[PDB]
């Protein structure tokens, strides 16, 4: 039926969604692991100055 | 239509394949970030250390 590829394609989009803020997720922690990896050499760079 | 629940089922399992994808990256990147966040903290308590 069309409920059948309706309820498929609400899994199927949804996913595609899901998908979007899987991604919205990985692509901020991967510009927070940069954030994280420049505030942790922020902070080892700092190290060094105040070593 | 008729077939449609079975591309969407399909594009479902990619979709999911794909925000699953986005989403261990995410938990990656999570444990990551919390990786050198823990790094970071080491760093910044080294900083206080050292400040």
Redesign the interface.
């Known amino acids: ?2 409920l ?2 309706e ?3 609400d ?3 949804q ?2 969604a ?2 979007k ?3 919205d ?2 692509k901020q ?2 510009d ?2 940069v954030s ?2 420049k ?2 050499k922020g ?2 760079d ?2 060094d100055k ?2």
Do not use: F
């Open positions: 039926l069309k059948d590829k309820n498929a394609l899994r199927a989009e996913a595609e899901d998908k803020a899987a991604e997720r990985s922690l991967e927070e692991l994280l990896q505030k942790l902070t080892e700092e190290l105040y070593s």
